[PDB]
Ligand binder design. Structure first.
Ligand SMILES: Cc1ccc(-n2nc(C(C)(C)C)cc2NC(=O)Nc2ccc(OCCN3CCOCC3)c3ccccc23)cc1
Length: 325
């Protein structure tokens, strides 16, 4: 048990071990608040997350446990991972706050070579997480860490990048909702503008159908919601657009990979595994270093336990954490 020192950053207090210095507020909000700091034990700059009120409700305590256990299983280059994780209390009774650490990467994702490297790393990071049965569901430029080397990591701190089959609100889509999010990002990189800046769910939907055109008899026969079907079918029939003319001036392999990422039928959208195998990442693909992730247990997701129960479980995770080599 190292020396823990206290300090009031923003409207918040911070009680972290001596080894972390130059605590510089970087961001706060709906999650906890992050501070950039320097790790004298390893010489590296880090990002430290102080989870808000870890266990103020059952949703807070469950969510807490869910972040810790994920990041504790996440070990990939193109995916945020756990350097350290600590707290100032000894014994479960005193356990009140949790802090997380990671490689300070600087800047958020917010040149055909640059969109080539950049996007390749997202799909590489996605295939991995997805291979563990995890779906980001919140993929957007602000959730993509990138250093000056253009090296990019995925994390999770709009509707604009959300998949169609979840604007209407589906109860069980697939992992490719993430692939749609990528296609939206790749389009922003190449053009500079937000593909679908819908002002509302319904608006956003109009926007999306304008480019991709409205559903076919095959897709339509795949929606249970009369409401959802009634909303879509109730929109003026629209011809899908000529992506070529939409993204004129871009490498036609990038245009072609897009056509495969922005398909309304999640059942016919390209997966990450498959995306990496596109000709657009020929200069970067290598099937021998696009790893998958060990098996991830999220059966806990299904249960409803007491806050103290969720709390103990997390206490446990903390103390059983082993730092990377
Ligand atoms: C409940 C919950 C469960 C899971 C998540 N979740 N899911 C993912 C995956 C899917 C991408 C693996 C990632 C996360 N969690 C995070 O992305 N958490 C974080 C966000 C931003 C951070 O630092 C921001 C500062 N930024 C980082 C890089 O350096 C520059 C600044 C963090 C710093 C230290 C520890 C966690 C951080 C989130 C919440």
């Amino acid at each position: 048990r190292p020396t823990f020192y206290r300090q009031e950053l923003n409207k918040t207090i911070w009680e972290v071990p001596e080894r972390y210095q130059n605590l510089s507020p970087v961001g706060s909000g709906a999650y906890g608040s992050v501070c950039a700091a320097f790790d004298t034990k390893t010489g590296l700059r880090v990002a430290v997350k102080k989870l808000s009120r870890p266990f103020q409700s059952i949703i807070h305590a469950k969510r807490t446990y869910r972040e810790l256990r994920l990041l504790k299983h996440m070990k990939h280059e193109n995916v945020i991972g756990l350097l350290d994780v600590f707290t100032p209390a000894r014994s479960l009774e005193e356990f009140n706050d949790v802090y997380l650490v990671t490689h300070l990467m600087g800047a958020d994702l917010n040149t055909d070579d640059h969109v080539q490297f950049l996007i390749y790393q997202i799909l590489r990071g996605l295939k991995y997480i997805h291979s563990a049965d995890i779906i980001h569901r919140d993929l957007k430029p602000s959730n993509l860490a990138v250093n000056e080397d253009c090296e990019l990591k995925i994390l999770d701190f709009t509707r604009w990048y959300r998949a169609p089959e979840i604007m209407l609100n589906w109860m069980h889509y697939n992992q490719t909702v993430d692939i749609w999010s990528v296609g939206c990002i790749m389009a922003e990189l190449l053009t500079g503008r937000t593909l679908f800046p819908g002002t509302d769910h319904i608006d956003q939907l109009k926007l999306i159908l304008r480019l991709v055109g409205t559903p076919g008899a095959e897709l339509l026969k795949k929606i249970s919601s009369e409401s959802a079907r009634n909303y879509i079918q109730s929109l003026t029939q629209m011809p899908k657009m000529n992506f070529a003319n939409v993204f004129i001036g871009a490498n036609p392999l990038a245009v072609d990979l897009l056509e495969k990422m922005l398909v309304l039928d999640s059942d016919k959208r390209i997966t990450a595994a498959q995306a990496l195998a596109h000709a657009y990442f020929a200069q970067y693909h290598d099937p021998d270093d696009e790893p998958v992730a060990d098996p991830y247990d999220q059966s806990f997701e299904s249960r409803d336990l007491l806050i103290d129960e969720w709390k103990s479980l997390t206490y446990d995770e903390v103390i059983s954490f082993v730092p990377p080599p």
